[model samples]
Target: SEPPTLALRLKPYKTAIQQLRSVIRALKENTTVTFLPTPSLILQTVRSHCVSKITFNSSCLYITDKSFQPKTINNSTPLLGNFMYLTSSKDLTKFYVQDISDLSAKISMCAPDFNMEFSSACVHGQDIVRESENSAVHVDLDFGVVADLLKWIGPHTGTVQILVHAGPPAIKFILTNGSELEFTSNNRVSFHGVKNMRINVQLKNFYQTLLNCAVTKLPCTLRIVTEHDTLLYVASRNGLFAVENFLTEE
Candidate 1:
């Protein structure tokens, strides 16, 4: 509704670029750059600003802030028959999705299908929230249908999380975007304590990476170790993060 003020647009743009350049320099200086890669994060920072409008099967608008009002765009053919949920990235708030509507129009550092409007043009990132995991509800959709919806947007549309039992065979959870979450069990075997308890989770899979490679679809395999309280999540490559308090102890 409001074009970002000139000062607002330029100032944050200026700052983001500076940080972008700094990250680039760091990336150029280091090849691995895997430990919280600055380039991956900063690259997305700029991409979020480069696009205007996106029309596709569906779009995932990450609610990275508590102040985020659940609103919709006018005169737009919004999508339905999909899944929407949130995750705590342990940093400033971040949102993930399963699919988006538009893919042609390229925007700022965010994914081509993934659009961040207010934050793109000289906007501050959302505050890092420590909300309880139970606060967010995961909407189950037709996995196959939504997976196809993502294809309409692009190969990199959104991500999804799956809770799997740690079978003795050990399995990996793969998402629609070719990203996978691997689960390894150290304490419990044959899904002993996992069926009834919520724990922290981290993943490492070949197809699932959370370090900002424009991955919208991620299938995650959860390891069962309810004996403990922490879940380790490993991405497709080597990225790792955690989510806590998802299940009841009873």
Candidate 2:
């Protein structure tokens, strides 16, 4: 072989794997993953906007989900079935796994074509704002305010309720303990057409959306549909940002 394909040591292997686990934890269902030779790893599920990407050291190898199957050693069924063989086309040493769920049940040999653009991030938020801009219904929350709201909502529930009031432009959340955390309209947050909008959405998706940006140091803009069907958040810096869409509770 011109360039040998094998597994090599990974830096901070344990930490990287743990983060991957966290990303998957946000998802409610199983997902398909891609392990690239160039070492860009992606985890995506169909249920939520909790996709995550990781770039690791490249080596000399590639494999597909088909590799995650029952195995036999010495013509005897192995104690473990599914496994992940982390090999690179650039190196001779790689890491393999007895439990493929540590990665994902399904792994791809090719890189995914992901459409994660920033401008697209604001579409849902903008549409919601525009649809209710001059209508009888509207909701307003400041960037600084939402950051705090998320913290308060974090420990309470997997899903949080957004209760809006029309007396003024503000949003209030009723915590699990029946206590209310309210953020009223300020110079930073005001709406011309404010409505008493209320809806519930998965906290896991909502919080994960913001958490992903904190590490990247990007500012996020959020939008809520008057119907309370979806929440859109977008973070952009240097013409780069990620768009995550969260569907509201029905």
Candidate 3:
């Protein structure tokens, strides 16, 4: 006895749900959840991240938190359904409360105004990611560099202060708790010294998702850059992916 509209199933929905819950939790108090559902993909982002905006593209999803504390996490799977939105006051309960053994659910597309508003949101998010990529100090991550980082840091959930320098191009990771690790052009190609910049991001969320995406697309390296109000944009073809995220300077 399922509702008879366009039914959708999130493959490995449990994992997706788990990640989504974490994303929602990260919002803390700015709990309005937005979904830009698509037949080809879906983008769900927290308002707390960008304050009043959400942006997405084919490769990158950009979220803005309370301030310009942009970090990065890459997710591989496409959002698997039609356009829809869920919030604390709306369909949020239905997601957790419903029986979704199939990772399946249905949504409403009954109103023109809602559809227009929803389309506007999705486009805005996508445009945000796309527009930034057009003008960025981009770098492609190297596998060896990523490996060395995880090895040095030991995968603890911590904040990573990433420093990129210009004079000959170098990369450094300073874990707030302790240890300092560095990488160079000799070890990583992307370390091309991009004008001395530093940003702090949630290491666990970013690296954890990177590893998750790596499982499927191993030796997968993330291409990233910081832009537009301290937001970091990361993209990958293979593994290391996760739910929507928000992190402040740490």
Worst 10 residues of 1 by lDDT: 30-39
lDDT by residue for model 3 (37-109), tens: 2211233333332321222222322211222211121121134221222322232222211112233222222
- Each candidate: what lDDT? 0.24, 0.40, 0.39
List the RMSD of every prediction in angstroms: 17.3, 12.8, 12.1
lDDT of 2 by residue, 103-165 (tens): 222222221332211100001111111223323434444566656755765674445566667
The number of the candidate with the highest TM-score is 3
Distance (Å) between predicted and true CA of 54, model 2? Answer: 12
TM-score of candidate 1 to 2 decimals: 0.21
Best by lDDT: 2
TM-score of every model versus the real structure: 0.21, 0.43, 0.46
The runs of at least 3 residues in candidate 3 whose Cα sits more than 4 Å from the true structure, single-residue gaps closed, are 1-39, 43-131, 134-136, 155-157, 191-193, 216-227, 239-248
lDDT of 1 at 198: 30
For model 1, the stretches where C-alpha displacement exceeds 4 angstroms are 1-127, 131-155, 158-161, 166-171, 177-193, 196-209, 212-250
Candidate 2 residue 147 Cα shift, in angstroms, is 3.4
